[PDB]
Structures are given as C-alpha cells and as structure tokens.
Design a protein around this ligand. Sequence first.
Ligand SMILES: Cc1cc2nc3c(=O)[nH]c(=O)nc-3n(C[C@H](O)[C@H](O)[C@H](O)COP(=O)(O)OP(=O)(O)OC[C@H]3O[C@@H](n4cnc5c(N)ncnc54)[C@H](O)[C@@H]3O)c2cc1C
Ligand SMILES: CCCCCCCCCCCCCCCC[N+](C)(C)C
Ligand SMILES: CCCCCCCCCCCCCCCC[N+](C)(C)C
Ligand SMILES: CCCCCCCCCCCCCCCC[N+](C)(C)C
Length: 433
Amino acid sequence: PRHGFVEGTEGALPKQADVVVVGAGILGIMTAINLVERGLSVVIVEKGNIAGEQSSRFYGQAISYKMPDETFLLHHLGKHRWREMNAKVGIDTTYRTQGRVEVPLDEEDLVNVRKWIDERSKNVGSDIPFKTRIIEGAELNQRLRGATTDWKIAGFEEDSGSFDPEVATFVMAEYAKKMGVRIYTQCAARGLETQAGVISDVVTEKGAIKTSQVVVAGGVWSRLFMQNLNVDVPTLPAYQSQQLISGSPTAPGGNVALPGGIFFREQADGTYATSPRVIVAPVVKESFTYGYKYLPLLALPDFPVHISLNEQLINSFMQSTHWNLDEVSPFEQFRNMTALPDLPELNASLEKLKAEFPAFKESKLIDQWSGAMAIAPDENPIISEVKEYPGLVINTATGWGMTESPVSAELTADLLLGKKPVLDPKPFSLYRF
Ligand SMILES: Cc1cc2nc3c(=O)[nH]c(=O)nc-3n(C[C@H](O)[C@H](O)[C@H](O)COP(=O)(O)OP(=O)(O)OC[C@H]3O[C@@H](n4cnc5c(N)ncnc54)[C@H](O)[C@@H]3O)c2cc1C
Ligand SMILES: CCCCCCCCCCCCCCCC[N+](C)(C)C
Ligand SMILES: CCCCCCCCCCCCCCCC[N+](C)(C)C
Ligand SMILES: CCCCCCCCCCCCCCCC[N+](C)(C)C
C-alpha cells in the first residue's frame, strides 16, 4: 500500500505479566524476543501503533564504519545477527548484505580512515571476520557507476547491511507475536507502582498490569518516563529529514557516502533512500540545564548539527515533569508527533544527487518524512540497570538502534535477569555522566 502496519493483540488488558516492555519500537520488540527465548512471557505496551516512530523513519544502513571502541562490537555483531535474521524469522526482513563506499573529505580524513581500519584489523575483538578495506581504481568505479566526479579513493565496508524502514521492524513484530509476545497498541504507560523496593504494577490508560520486571524502550520519550520516577536520563532531541525516490536501470546500487552531502542507499525493491547530512537540534528546556555537555560535538566542523528555535521549546515548557498515574500523561497529550520534513533542504540535497549521479534525474519522489532522535552527551546508547528501581532496565538513546538491536536486546535481558552481560555494560551505563 505505502507504509506497512502490524495489528496489536486484541481483547482485554491482562491482569499479570512476567515482564512489561514500554514501547513497540525495534529495541522493545527485540528485547521481548530475547526474553521469550529465555522462557519469560512478555507484554509490550505501545502508546501509538507498532513501530510508528524511529523504527519506521530511519535511513537504513547497518554499518560498523568509523565506530568507536565503545560501540564497535555492538555494531559488528549486530551485522552478524542480522545476517542470520531472514533464516531465523523465515520471512524477509529486507536485510541485505550490501557494501558501502565512503570517499573521504580531506587527505587528513583519509589518514584517519586508514588508521581506524588498520587499528581494528589487528585487534578485532571477535571471531567474526572483519571485512572493511580501502579501495582504489576499478573496484571503486564499479561501485560508483554513472558518477560525474572522478573519485579516486574510498573506504569500503563490504559487509555493510541494508534494511528498509517500511518493512524491517514490522516483520520483527509479527515474528515476536508468533512467539507469544503480546503487544497492546493505543495504550500508553504512564508509570509504575512500587512497594518496599519491588515494582508491583505498570499503570496504563487501559488499566494496570501486575509485574515486578520492566523494560523501558520508549525511544525519545524514555527521559520523560523516568522523570516522573525521579531518575535523570540525559537526552536531547535531534531531527533529520529523509526522502525516498524510485529506481533506475542505470542506477549504481549499494550504499554510497560522498563529499558534498551525497548519501544514498538502494532498498530491497530497487527504490533508493537518500538524505542530507544535516542534523537539527531544537532548543528545549533541557538545553539550558545540561546542553553544555553537548558542546564538544559542535567542535567538529565536519559535524552537521544546527541549533534551531521552533515549537519544541514551547512544547517542552508545557510538558509536565510530574503527573499522577490516574490522570492524563504527556504520552497521551502529545501521543502522535507532528514534525514535518524540511522540503527546501530535501530538494537541494536531491538536486546535488542528480548532478553527481544523472541516473536519478528521472526518479520520482515516493515519500518524505522527518525523524526524531534522542541522543546522550557522548553519542552512545543507554543500556542500563536502574539503581533506584530493582527489576527496571532501560534500552534507549541511540542513533543506531536498528543495527544495535539484536545485541542490545541480549544485553538488556542480561542486566534484567542478573546474567553476565554479552559486552562491557559500563559505556552503556546511565550513571556514566
Ligand atoms: C532520521 C533517522 C535516521 C536513522 N538512520 C539509521 C540508520 O541508518 N541505521 C541505524 O541503525 N539506525 C538509524 N536510526 C535510528 C533508529 O531508528 C533508532 O535508534 C531505533 O528505532 C531506536 O528504537 P527504539 O525502539 O528505542 O525507539 P522507537 O523506534 O521510537 O520506539 C519507541 C516506542 O516507544 C513508544 N513509547 C514511548 N513512550 C511510551 C509510553 N509511556 N507508553 C507506551 N509506549 C511508549 C513510542 O510510541 C515508540 O513507538 C535513525 C533514526 C532517525 C531518526
Ligand atoms: C535571550 C534570553 C531570553 C530568555 C528567555 C528564555 C525563556 C524562553 C521564553 C519563551 C520565548 C518564546 C520562544 C518561542 C519559539 C517558538 N516558535 C519559533 C515556534 C515561535
Ligand atoms: C514577551 C514574551 C512573552 C513570551 C511568553 C510565552 C511563553 C508561553 C509558553 C507556555 C508556558 C508553559 C505553560 C506552563 C504550564 C506547564 N507546567 C504545569 C508543567 C508548569
Ligand atoms: C548548546 C546546546 C547544544 C545542543 C546540541 C545537541 C546535539 C544533538 C545530538 C545530535 C548528534 C547525534 C548524531 C547522530 C545521528 C546519526 N544518525 C543519522 C545515524 C541517526
């Protein structure tokens, strides 16, 4: 049709659940799956529709490229587990092993790229083979078919993944449901009841579910959920426009990242996803409190963050920091995000793409949207225990949640159940700030 939809679990809201997941995005869905495999019966509550936010509004690349030591193995294994996903689910998630070329900006960028590849080749940290190398000549020109500029050198992540926003998370939701995961849609989680340390209930607009174990995977809303429970989660909003164009017989295929803001990725159906580099950070109330911690990100001149003043500031001041569980929460008050794509920005970006790859000159515009992130000061995920509430774990605050989800899921479940974590959880801890 155009977008793809998964229907929620029908009937009455259950009295009891072994574990309740807040949010039916990728992180919530994958964590649910991981828990079921361990033998737990899970219930996901979702304020809107399944994968209505970030998890159907992403660019679509699963890459380990330029990733720091903190997140590399989370991405490296994410790629590996996504390669087994189609076989595991038995339905096409649209995950493809695609390949990605990034032409560096400066000679200095080329040295930084070379060093990063060389450092990671000598010490991989996994028995999964590392498949990223610098490419020149014929190998590069085959990857850039019908390019105007004579590009000489690029970093080639051969095993870079591709997933499509209109399909990926939705298939994973249906697979979750087939495992016995119950997902209740249009059903916002306001907060939780706690008695003598142990969680007793999760309170929703449809009623209360008795549980002692909670997974918070509310995407951009995770901070606001933990605010009402008096736990500080440091995230700031970020926005990026995305667009989707039709295919071409003379189109180059694969994933391409070029100087001059040229970024495109071929989908499973032959259509092309493209976007500008520019990330828009709107001014919120939180900007005045801990926005100073985000200043070293504005340091890089290759960094594309614009500070913007819009309606988010006004919305921020009129979102409550505290609410009673028997009254209307901001998750109901601001249920559906209404953020629009920057249409002049997307147009200029597309015109640059058409100038570099004239194969796209005849391509028709399929879809244009805005995508909202929430990012921590060091740009790394929050996958953590919550000291203040035993049995509560949080899986959120990531710009790479699709790639990271199969490993994030296991790591979240490990923290919840007291098992030794898959990877070092210290860089993903809530208390690192
Ligand atoms: C423009 C853009 C491009 C991106 N490109 C890429 C990419 O190329 N590669 C990549 O790996 N990643 C990419 N990402 C990131 C990826 O989309 C996210 O990191 C991932 O979807 C995070 O999943 P999530 O479940 O935490 O958040 P979401 O998918 O937003 O899920 C959170 C859900 O929780 C629900 N919720 C919140 N509060 C409550 C409540 N109180 N009660 C009930 N439900 C609640 C929300 O309605 C929402 O559906 C991109 C993101 C954006 C915005
Ligand atoms: C320069 C320092 C001024 C201190 C005031 C800080 C508090 C903010 C007061 C509200 C200002 C209104 C901003 C409205 C922006 C929304 N729109 C862009 C959509 C109009
Ligand atoms: C001359 C410039 C005046 C600009 C002032 C406009 C500010 C209006 C913004 C709305 C303020 C939010 C309302 C507070 C209620 C929310 N809380 C209950 C959470 C405090
Ligand atoms: C002075 C106030 C500073 C506030 C700036 C806040 C910065 C917002 C953080 C955005 C940077 C994260 C970039 C990740 C984007 C990656 N993806 C495009 C893949 C999602």
